[PDB]
Design a protein around this ligand. Sequence first.
Ligand SMILES: CCCCCCCCCCCCCCC
Ligand SMILES: [Cl-]
Ligand SMILES: [Cl-]
Ligand code: NA
Ligand code: NA
Ligand code: NA
Ligand SMILES: [Sr+2]
Length: 296
Amino acid sequence: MVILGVGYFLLGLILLYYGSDWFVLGSERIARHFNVSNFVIGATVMAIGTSLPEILTSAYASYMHAPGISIGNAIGSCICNIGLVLGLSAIISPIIVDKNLQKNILVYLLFVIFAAVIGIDGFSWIDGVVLLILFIIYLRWTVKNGSAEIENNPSVVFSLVLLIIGLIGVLVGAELFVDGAKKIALALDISDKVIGFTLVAFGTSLPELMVSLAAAKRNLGGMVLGNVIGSNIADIGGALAVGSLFMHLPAENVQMAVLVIMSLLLYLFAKYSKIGRWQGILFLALYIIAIASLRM
Ligand SMILES: CCCCCCCCCCCCCCC
Ligand SMILES: [Cl-]
Ligand SMILES: [Cl-]
Ligand code: NA
Ligand code: NA
Ligand code: NA
Ligand SMILES: [Sr+2]
């Protein structure tokens, strides 16, 4: 079963690599079909589609009476998306944010701060209902300001096929990757549960990572930023929220503070500067410091 672990691992990588490119390409075409910006398609369809692991993991964990894992998943993924995911992408393809998208990032920051404040004492099921609703409002507000009201085609059909098959590719690939790695570690008897549930946020962050990198290579910085901003909101208003429904989630004040600081930096760079190499390097530096000092 060490061989079936290597098999899953490698093929999971292959599915993640090509699958992410198809998802990116299919999303880019869809955005042009619905006359919406790449940021919008990244903030909605791509963000939610790639946060399906987080939502399912947080829901399942809290249902299995592990609310620590549930919120850990969620917040940990947000920190990962800014520090690691956006950090790598910014360096690859620097982003100059237009004033319109700056408003969106400011709203994001407000949402994050609000989540941190109401979460000081933990997250009740009521907290989850509120966040989930703001999640919904955010999506509709984002789509409205990023769409243009104007107008069964083989260009449209091929676009949806690319996106859906691509999405299946990154979700399955990320699962095979995690499966394969864990069954390699079990056959080698180097299995570690504490390390395992430390990487829970990363395994679920695999789709965001590969998808953003794919978009970064094609200079789709708006799509990248949309995917990051939307995934975080999807992780909080979706994964965290659903987790709180099954069970009260314990306070993660240190992690929330880290996320707030990163989110604040993200807004400030977007408004007064750019999200380029040195902003990207800083994000990675902070992320590395984070995974070196935060409790496992
Ligand atoms: C396409 C040209 C890319 C040049 C990339 C330079 C990247 C420097 C990354 C430094 C990361 C530091 C992380 C903390 C040690
Ligand atoms: Cl727990
Ligand atoms: Cl773009
Ligand atoms: Na996501
Ligand atoms: Na994810
Ligand atoms: Na994640
Ligand atoms: Sr609370």
